[PDB]
Amino acid sequence: SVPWFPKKISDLDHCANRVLMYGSELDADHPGFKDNVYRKRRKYFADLAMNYKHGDPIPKVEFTEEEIKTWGTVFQELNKLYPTHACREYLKNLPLLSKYCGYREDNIPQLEDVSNFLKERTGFSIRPVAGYLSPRDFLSGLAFRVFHCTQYVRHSSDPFYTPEPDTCHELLGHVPLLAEPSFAQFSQEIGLASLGASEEAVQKLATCYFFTVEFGLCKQDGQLRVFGAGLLSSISELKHALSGHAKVKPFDPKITCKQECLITTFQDVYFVSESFEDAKEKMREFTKTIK
Template identity: 35%
Template sequence: MGQAPVVYGQSDRPPRGDYSRAKEDYTCAQDYAAYTEADHATYHRLYERQSALLPGLASQHFIDALPALGAKERIPRFEEVNERLYKATGWEIVGVPGLIPEVPFFSLLAQRKFPVTDWIRRPEEFEYIVEPDIFHDLFGHIPLLFNPVIADFVQAYGQGGLKAAELGACEMLSRLYWYTIEFGLIRESGGVRAYGAGILSSAGELNYSVTSPEPHRLPLELERAMRTLYKIDTYQQTYFVIDDMQQLLDLANADFAPLYAQLRQQPTIGAKQLLAGEQLIPV
């Protein structure tokens, strides 16, 4: 295929995956027979641990949607998840060998197809894995695609991503994805709760993002988030907080072209840098 995945965050190792199995759009069939009993056991252990940590830390939107993912004892079959997901919001999941390039990624999202890595982490990676595996993608991302507002937001993001690719603005848009869909927080129950997949699939970051005094938590503003750098192999140093899910869809429906032009004239912001006058959201 010749086109390597783009990773804007910093990491000490490249993403892995067997891309020889992928079709032109980078999708591949889920080779369900290839999963070992150890693979299924790893998925079950991860699911049990994460689901036990959700109360008081995860968004109620996510907690309510999680049962729709299906049985937790074994790695789900994509076609079985799709039967429920398509009926709920018109989305489906498709297998991919790992991280994929931007334009194919955006194209899939624009078609309401969510790419899910079909391999699972090794036992020695149980606590932490840099690149997304099937547990991160399924447990972290898919439940909220049963939510109509998030389902529409992710599609709108994909459509916007195709436009950003034409304008050479993918890196700026990737930061919005990172700080919302992957590592977003939402105001709930008199505090903040996690809705981002990167948080929800991480035992350590779930608690850290909601309760630790160390990171900065700021109200989500498009320009601020799209200027802010991030790393992919540590807990986040800054989180952006939305008031409700509808706020995401409202943001995604804006015309980003003028904003990209404006952002090109401004410096990036460090991952834990505060700007003058910014007020942190308390926990």
């Protein structure tokens, strides 16, 4: 039978707290694993998300000088790379965020402000999330153009620490493309396809999501460009993805969904979409075969 799925945006209240791994549950190898102050801070953030209910303004956070410096370091280095690496759409929307949401080296944008910006641009909004959700619950947010979004900042000891999302990843990797109508439609349709789908189908949709939204490449005016958020917030892999050292295959959901999603290393392969519109068309054909 069909598993429960959210029927309206406020129904995400009922699954967004189904957290499998809380954000305060640091990995053994986490840079902050032995840092008690950081652990409390991570608790503070997880509790903010847990207490959030749809309709709430997303709580504003006073980031510490240390957190802001970490953001600044990440922001400054990535922005050197974006003009030669990022896709059309990303480069078009990034300056709008500097103008209206306070994206600057010395200021971490607030999720509420970013959410309000996205609502006007594409109907996308942000929901703070305590930690890891099932693929089903995470993707279901996208059906209502809701992006589940971490609010904490990576540990300052390693501004280059990438195997968990932090708010640097969300704001620099995800948000500029959620502001693009073609991409917002593509993302929403992943979520819509996932609603009430089989466990098998959800897993395949999650893998397609991974190799587009998180690690996707696209071809634009004959050039390979980056649109994956995991790449756009990782200085080293951003460079690697467009070097000659990377293996690239065309995006093709029936083949892409067989690919293992790697966590603690660079991906072994990247998938190239022709455009957001083509990727959307390919998913539509694919979802008919699994749902």
